[PDB]
C-alpha cells in the first residue's frame, strides 16, 4: 500500500481507530492511568492523519508492528511500572512483539469494576458521552487483554444504545438496569467461550479442532461441496491459532481475508450471507460469524449408500482415514442441524472405531453391516435429557427449577463448596430457560453453547482448589465426553453428614428488606445446606421442610413484630423439621 497506518485509518474511518488504538493499549498497558491512554491516542491519530496527507511522509513507511512498538518503548516509567517488559524493547522485530506478547498479564490486580447509581450514570453520560465510554472502554480492556478488540468495540456500541435510549425514559432504573444485566452476561459469555476455543486447541491439537470445525460448518453451510468446506476448515483453522498466540494485527488480517473470501464465492457457500456481506469491513467477519443456518437441499440421498453398504468402504477410508472421516461428519453434520456438534463427533468417533475394528476381518459389509444402529442411542440420550429437564422447567419456574437441580447436584458431589454449587445451579437453571423456549429444533446446539462455558467454569474452579476426583475424572476427560461424565454422576452413597449448626439455620427479618435476587441466594444456600445434613430426605420430607420455611418466611415478614417471630418461630421451624427428618 505504501503506508499501512494511512491504509488502516482510511478504511477503518477515524472514530473507530481511535476505539481500537485505545482498546490495543490497554491490553498490553494494563496500569498506566486512563489520561495516559488518551495521550497516546490523540499523538498516534495526528501521525495517522499526517500519513492520509502524504503517504511519503515521516515514518507512514514503516509497518504497524514497528510504529506500535516504538510508541511503547517511549513510556518513560515502562521500566519502573513493568520492569521486565522494558527489555522488550531492546530487541528488535519480530523478537521484540513475541516478547510483548510473553509479557501480557492475562489476569491483573486490578479491583472489581462497580456499578455506580443510574442517575450518576446517565449524568456522566450525559455531560460527557465520549470520555464516560472511552474511560469504561479502557476499564474493560485492561481487564480482559486478549478479548478481540473489533468485538470488545461491537460490544460498546451496544452499551452507547442503553444509554441514548433509558437515560431519557421515565423510569431509568427499570429501562438500564436489565439491558446492562444482559450485556454483562452475553460479554462474560462470549470471553468465555474465546478462552475455552483457546484451550482445547491446545489440549487436542489441531486434529480434532478440525473435527470439530468441519460439523460445525457443514450444519450451517449444508449446500456448500466438501472441497469448500475443507477449504474453509483449513482457514479457520489458522485463524483461530493466530488470534489464540494473542497478535491482534495478525489475526484481524487473518479474519478479514476469510470474510471478503467467503463474500466473493457467497454463491458457493451459504445463501444467507446476503446482509453481512453488504456491511462495512469492521463488522463482516462478526455478521458471518453469527448467521443463521442456511436451508438443506431437500435432494439429499441416505448415508447409508455411501457409508454402510460397502461398496468398497474400507478401500476407500484406508485411501485417507481423515478425509474420509471428514466426509462422514459433512454429510452427517449437515443433516442435521438439530444435533449438538459434540453428538456429531460422538458419532463419528463411533463410526471410526467400527472402521478400525471391522476393515480388518474377513468380510467386512456384515461387520460394520449395522453401525447407524450403534448411534440411536447416542442419539437419545441428549435428546431425552432435554425434554425431561425442559418439561421440568416449564412445571416448575426457573426460580424453583433452580432448587430442583440444586438438591440433584448437593447430592452427587455434596464435597463441593456452597457457594459454588449455588452460582452452578444458577447458571444451570438459566440454559434453562434461555433454551427450553426454542422449538426442539435448536434446542441441543442452545444448550451446548451454553452449557459448554458453565462447565468450564465449573471445572476452573475445581482447578484451583479441588474436591473430588469424580469432578477431576471429567473436567480432564475429553471435550466430547465431558457432558456424558457429569450427567452420570450418582449419588454418593459414601458421603457422611455434615454436623447441624444452629447458625446456619437462624434467619432475622432483614431478609425482608433484601433484593428479590438476594432472598433467593440466602434461600438457595439455606438449602444446599440442607441437603449436606441430610443427604438422604426425600423430595418429599423435603419438600415439606420447604413448605413449612416459605410460610415461616411470610408469616413474620408480613406481620408487626419482625424479628421475635423470626425467633420464636424459628426455633420451632429448626425443632420440627429436624424431628421430620433424621
Ligand atoms: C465494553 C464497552 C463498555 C463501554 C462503556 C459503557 C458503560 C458500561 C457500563 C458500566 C457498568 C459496568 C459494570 C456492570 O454492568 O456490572
Ligand atoms: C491502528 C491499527 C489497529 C489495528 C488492530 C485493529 C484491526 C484493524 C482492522 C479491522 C479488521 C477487522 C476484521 C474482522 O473482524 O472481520
Ligand atoms: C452446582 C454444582 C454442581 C457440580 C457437579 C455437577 C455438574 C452437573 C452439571 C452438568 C449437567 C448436565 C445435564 C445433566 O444433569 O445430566
Ligand atoms: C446447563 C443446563 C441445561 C438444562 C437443559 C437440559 C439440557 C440437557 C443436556 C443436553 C446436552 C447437549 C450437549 C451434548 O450432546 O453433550
Ligand atoms: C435440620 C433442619 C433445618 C431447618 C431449616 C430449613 C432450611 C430452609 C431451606 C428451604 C428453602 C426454600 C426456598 C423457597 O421456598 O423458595
Ligand atoms: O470468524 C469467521 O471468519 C467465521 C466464518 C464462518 C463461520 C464461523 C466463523 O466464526
Redesign the pocket.
Known amino acids: 500500500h505504501k503506508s499501512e497506518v494511512a491504509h488502516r485509518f482510511k478504511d477503518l474511518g477515524e472514530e473507530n481507530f481511535k476505539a481500537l488504538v485505545l482498546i490495543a493499549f490497554a491490553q498490553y498497558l494494563q496500569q498506566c492511568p486512563f489520561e495516559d491512554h488518551v495521550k497516546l491516542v490523540n499523538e498516534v491519530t495526528e501521525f495517522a492523519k499526517t500519513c492520509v496527507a502524504d503517504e511519503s511522509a515521516e515514518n507512514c513507511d514503516k509497518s504497524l508492528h514497528t510504529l506500535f512498538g516504538d510508541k511503547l518503548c517511549t513510556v518513560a516509567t515502562l521500566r519502573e511500572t513493568y520492569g521486565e517488559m522494558a527489555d522488550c524493547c531492546a530487541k528488535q522485530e519480530p523478537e521484540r512483539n513475541e516478547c510483548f506478547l510473553q509479557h501480557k498479564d492475562d489476569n491483573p490486580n486490578l479491583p472489581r469494576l462497580v456499578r455506580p447509581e443510574v442517575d450518576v450514570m446517565c449524568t456522566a453520560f450525559h455531560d460527557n458521552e465520549e470520555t464516560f465510554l472511552k474511560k469504561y472502554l479502557y476499564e474493560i480492556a485492561r481487564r480482559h487483554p486478549y478479548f478481540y478488540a473489533p468485538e470488545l468495540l461491537f460490544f460498546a456500541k451496544r452499551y452507547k444504545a442503553a444509554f441514548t435510549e433509558c437515560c431519557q425514559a421515565a423510569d431509568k432504573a427499570a429501562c438500564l438496569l436489565p439491558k446492562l444485566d444482559e450485556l454483562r452476561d452475553e460479554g462474560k459469555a462470549s470471553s468465555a467461550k474465546q478462552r475455552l476455543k483457546c484451550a482445547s486447541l491446545q489440549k487436542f491439537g489441531e486434529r480434532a479442532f478440525k473435527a470439530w470445525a468441519v460439523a460445525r460448518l457443514s450444519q450451517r453451510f449444508p449446500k456448500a461441496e466438501f472441497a469448500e468446506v475443507s477449504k474453509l476448515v483449513t482457514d479457520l483453522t489458522k485463524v483461530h491459532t493466530e488470534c489464540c498466540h494473542g497478535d491482534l494485527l495478525e489475526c484481524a488480517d487473518d479474519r478479514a481475508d476469510l470474510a471478503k473470501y467467503i463474500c466473493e464465492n457467497q454463491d458457493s457457500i451459504s445463501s444467507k450471507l446476503k446482509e453481512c456481506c453488504e456491511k462495512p469491513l469492521l463488522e463482516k467477519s462478526h455478521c458471518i460469524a453469527e448467521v443463521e443456518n442456511d436451508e438443506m437441499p431437500a435432494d439429499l440421498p441416505s448415508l447409508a449408500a455411501d457409508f454402510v453398504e460397502s461398496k468398497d468402504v474400507c478401500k476407500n477410508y484406508a485411501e485417507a482415514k481423515d478425509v474420509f472421516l471428514g466426509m462422514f461428519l459433512y454429510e452427517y453434520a449437515r443433516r442435521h442441524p438439530d444435533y449438538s456438534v459434540v453428538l456429531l463427533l460422538r458419532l463419528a468417533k463411533t463410526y471410526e472405531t467400527t472402521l478400525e475394528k471391522c476393515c480388518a476381518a474377513a468380510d467386512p459389509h456384515e461387520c460394520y453391516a449395522k453401525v447407524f444402529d450403534e448411534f440411536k442411542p447416542l442419539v437419545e440420550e441428549p435428546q431425552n435429557?432435554i425434554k425431561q429437564?425442559c418439561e421440568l422447567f416449564e412445571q416448575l419456574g426457573e426460580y424453583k427449577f433452580q432448587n430442583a437441580?440444586?438438591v440433584?447436584?448437593?447430592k452427587?458431589?455434596p464435597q463441593?463448596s456452597t457457594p459454588?454449587?449455588?452460582?452452578?445451579?444458577r447458571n444451570?437453571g438459566k440454559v434453562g430457560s434461555k433454551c427450553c423456549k426454542h422449538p426442539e429444533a435448536k434446542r441441543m446446539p442452545c444448550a451446548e453453547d451454553y452449557?459448554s462455558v458453565?462447565?468450564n467454569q465449573?471445572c476452573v474452579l475445581h482447578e484451583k482448589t479441588p474436591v473430588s476426583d469424580r469432578?477431576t475424572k471429567c473436567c480432564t476427560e475429553s471435550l466430547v465426553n465431558r457432558?456424558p461424565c457429569?450427567?452420570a454422576?450418582e449419588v454418593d452413597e459414601t458421603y457422611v453428614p455434615k454436623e447441624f449448626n444452629a447458625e446456619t439455620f437462624t434467619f432475622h427479618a432483614d431478609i425482608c428488606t433484601l433484593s428479590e435476587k438476594e432472598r433467593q441466594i440466602k434461600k438457595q444456600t439455606a438449602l444446599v445446606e440442607l441437603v449436606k445434613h441430610k443427604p438422604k430426605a426425600t423430595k418429599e420430607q423435603l419438600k415439606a421442610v420447604m413448605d413449612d420455611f416459605a410460610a415461616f418466611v411470610e408469616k413474620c415478614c408480613k406481620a408487626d413484630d419482625k424479628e421475635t417471630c423470626f425467633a420464636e418461630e424459628g426455633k420451632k421451624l429448626v425443632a420440627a423439621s429436624q424431628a421430620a427428618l433424621g
Open positions: 435429557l429437564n437441580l440444586l440433584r447436584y448437593t452427587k458431589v463441593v459454588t454449587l449455588v452460582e452452578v445451579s444451570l452449557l458453565v462447565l465449573l469432578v457432558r457429569f450427567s454422576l
